[PDB]
């Protein structure tokens, strides 16, 4: 019994959209500089709910007006998905981000909205309040970037003790910080933002050696790829991005091994068949 919630944050409070309404959330996260995205198709909206939500979602009041100094400029929405049977819940968190676009896909008799949320869409920040370090090592520049963005950081890499001259003095906004941390040292070590945690790590290392996920049940077949193992699965509320996987397949016996995660393809539909997550993984070292 799938349980999917879309929880907005508005002045009135959190208005949770449950799974009783036709909801369809397509999320795609990855270990890059690009903001992970979630498309949301929500049907069955009443007139009052539409007035409460769509009118709040806007791109104005920061271009033709001022009304902006901090958050509340755009509504931040989180996603809590999982399963529930025998009374126990499994609602994890699968996405946190701010809306940017809203449209309508289905006309009457079912007025269905389709919003587009991106992680860290608050790039309308204080244009870098604190100046970057003049000379500093990679780990300390990462710490400065995390502090500027307001997110806790996980810096686990072998390039931390390398000095830089002018590490990001052309940066204009908070979002460009991640692009810069990605720009320097891009054979392996790609930094990204997963929810509210900024992860800077080598591509062949697991953020968490103790949090390997043993996988034995797959939808379809766990296959090879030009990098690693690619496979789809039913929603397990224990698979993050950059996490370690311990694939143990039946159809393909030689894809077994330990892999790290590079991409993630959530497709959750409460009132439709697709409730799968697709994992791109590469060999872990």
């Amino acid at each position: 019994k799938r349980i999917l919630r879309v929880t907005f944050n508005m002045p009135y409070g959190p208005e949770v959209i449950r799974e009783d309404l036709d909801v369809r959330v397509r999320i795609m996260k990855a270990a890059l500089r690009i903001q992970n995205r979630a498309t949301m198709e929500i049907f069955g909206l009443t007139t009052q709910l539409r007035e409460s939500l769509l009118s709040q979602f806007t791109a104005w009041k920061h271009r033709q007006r001022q009304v902006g100094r901090e958050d509340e400029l755009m509504i931040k929405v989180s996603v809590e998905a999982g399963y529930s049977d025998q009374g126990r819940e499994q609602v994890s968190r699968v996405f946190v981000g701010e809306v940017a676009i809203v449209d309508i896909i289905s006309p009457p008799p079912d007025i269905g909205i389709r919003i587009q949320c991106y992680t860290r869409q608050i790039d309308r920040t204080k244009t870098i309040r604190n100046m970057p370090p003049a000379n500093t090592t990679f780990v300390k520049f990462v710490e400065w970037g995390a502090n500027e963005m307001g997110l806790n950081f996980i810096c686990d890499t072998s390039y931390n003790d390398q000095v830089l001259k002018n590490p990001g003095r052309s940066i204009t906004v908070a979002s460009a910080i991640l692009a810069s941390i990605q720009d320097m040292y891009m054979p392996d070590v790609a930094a990204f933002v997963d929810d509210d945690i900024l992860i800077v790590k080598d591509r062949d290392k697991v953020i968490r050696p103790d949090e390997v996920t043993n996988v034995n049940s797959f939808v379809g077949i766990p296959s090879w790829s030009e990098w690693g193992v690619e496979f789809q699965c039913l929603f397990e509320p224990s698979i993050r991005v950059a996490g370690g996987v311990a694939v143990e397949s039946l159809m393909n016996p030689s894809v077994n091994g330990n892999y790290v995660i590079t991409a993630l393809e959530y497709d959750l539909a409460s009132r439709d068949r697709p409730f799968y997550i697709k994992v791109m993984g590469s060999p872990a070292a």
Partner: peptide
């Protein structure tokens, strides 16, 4: 589809400074 990717490409090119 492709309109989603188009919207993504547009959102990439929005930052807080005009020049």
């Amino acid at each position: 589809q492709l309109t989603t990717a188009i919207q993504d490409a547009q959102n990439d090119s929005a930052t807080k400074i005009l020049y």
